[PDB]
Amino acid sequence: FLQINGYAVSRGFKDLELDTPSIEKRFAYSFLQQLIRYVDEAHQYILEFDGGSRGKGEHFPYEQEIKFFAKVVLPLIDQYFKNHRLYFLSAASRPLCSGGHASNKEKEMVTSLFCKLGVLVRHRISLFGNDATSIVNCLHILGQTLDARTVMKTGLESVKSALRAFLDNAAEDLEKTMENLKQGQFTKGVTQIINYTTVALLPMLSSLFEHIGQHQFGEDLILEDVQVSCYRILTSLYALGTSKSIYVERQRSALGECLAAFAGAFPVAFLETHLDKHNIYSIYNTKSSRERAALSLPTNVEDVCPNIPSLEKLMEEIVELAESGIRYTQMPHVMEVILPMLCSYMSRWWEHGPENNPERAEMCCTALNSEHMNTLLGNILKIIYNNLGIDEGAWMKRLAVFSQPIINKVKPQLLKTHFLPLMEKLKKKAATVVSEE
């Protein structure tokens, strides 16, 4: 009857203002500040608890709080950043075409949370109550969710410094692992830091490097003095991988899988150092000689990584060991560390290789011919053929998984009649675990 008489009734109140532009209203916004405050709280609690932890009084006035953290906050962070992983990475490159581009503030708080979790987890795996696996999983997925390009082009200075200090600490700990394991084979602070490295530092760095390499964030994250930090990291991980020690034999494969990730993440052709002048991203070009001398830098691009052989040299000892046919036990270092390194490095640098882009030839960062990759994979074939004979191993799975990018870049016509032998050798040695493709 109101409508029939024509009277107009309406809502009791019309909103004075909708604050849609306000990013603070986003759920992830407040969720991230709550998580950041909780993580900083837990960090400072463990700071005053570093004293009581060496005492018998494990029950400490916020034992309930430290239990709440480990039992709730970490698992919820893990599940949340697994469920909304693609949400944070979508930054003006059109992932998740449904919509929902994450805020730059949210991205930088994600990076800050990553850094704070890393600082909390440094040298504390045994101190924390057997939840270090949960923490490393959380820091793993956060590493995959980091948006380096955006957080570096438009990010807060403290966050950028936190990421740089994270990289510096990750370099320093592994340098210390060298110092101790080379000076003394016998291994309790040294044992604690070695265990921390093996348990956490290698997988987390490997995951971060893999994410950076696959999303091409190495062209923006690592430009100044982080180049120097990762120079230390490279000259370090190579040394651990090639070192002879029964102590490092056990955790060795982690070093090899981290080196492969770093080789694809790192934006400078360290193996072919002679043509590093062409790389605009090289610290030797951007930093200038004065700042290079000011920093702890060798001032020689060829001498920045002395122990690491050049790509050419590495190539001929690979081919000669392929001809020699030494089994996996004789020279493991090369055969499950350098080979993944070579495969990942060349998969990373082929698109910059001269044959892909005819123009700007002889101004290329690296000459990385498809002939070079075909020869590498032929040598990998030859060594594996020598390998099917003597009692085999579990490492063929990792070798094939690391070498499959190479077989994908290999042309199908060169695949035919050349890698068909690999399958026929698979069949006629039926009792072999070699996994083709």
* Residues in contact with 231: Cβ distance below 8 Å, sequence separation at least 6, in sequence order: 283, 304, 305
Handedness of CA 183, 188, 190, 194 (dihedral sign): positive
Spell out where the chain is interrupted, by the residue before each break (C to N > 2.5 A). 187
* Residues in contact with 324: Cβ distance below 8 Å, sequence separation at least 6, in sequence order: none
Is the CB of residue 406 less than 8 Å from the CB of residue 399?
A: no
Give DSSP secondary structure letters for 76-123: HHHHHHHHTHHHHH-SSS--STTS-PPPHHHHHHHHHHHHHHHHHHTT
Place of tokens 């089994």: 327
**PDB experimental method:** cryo-EM
Which H or E run includes 84?
Answer: none
Residue 157 falls in which region: left (phi positive, over 0), alpha (psi -120 to 50) or beta? alpha
Is the CB of residue 315 less than 8 Å from the CB of residue 343?
A: no
Give DSSP secondary structure letters for 189-257: HHHHHHHHIIIIIHHHHHHHHHHHHHTTGGGTS-SSSHHHHHHHHHHHHHHHHH---HHHHTTHHHHHH
Place of tokens 């430290």: 66
Residue 338's alpha-carbon distances to 89, 303, 343, in angstroms, are 31, 20, 9
Residue 326's alpha-carbon distances to 257, 318, 335, 339, 390, in angstroms, are 22, 11, 10, 15, 10
Is the CB of residue 268 less than 8 Å from the CB of residue 275?
A: no
For residues 323 and 325, give the distance between their C-alpha atoms in angstroms, rounded to a whole number.
Answer: 5
Which H or E run includes 145?
Answer: helix 132-145
Is the CB of residue 232 less than 8 Å from the CB of residue 295?
A: no
Is the CB of residue 388 less than 8 Å from the CB of residue 425?
A: yes
Residue type, 300: N
* Residues in contact with 218: Cβ distance below 8 Å, sequence separation at least 6, in sequence order: 212, 265, 266, 267
Is the CB of residue 36 less than 8 Å from the CB of residue 109?
A: yes
**Token pair belonging to 199:** 């348990």
For residues 337 and 164, give the distance between their C-alpha atoms in angstroms, rounded to a whole number.
Answer: 27
Is the CB of residue 260 less than 8 Å from the CB of residue 341?
A: yes
Residue 233's nearest CA partner among 315, 283, 167 is: 167
For residues 434 and 326, give the distance between their C-alpha atoms in angstroms, rounded to a whole number.
Answer: 17
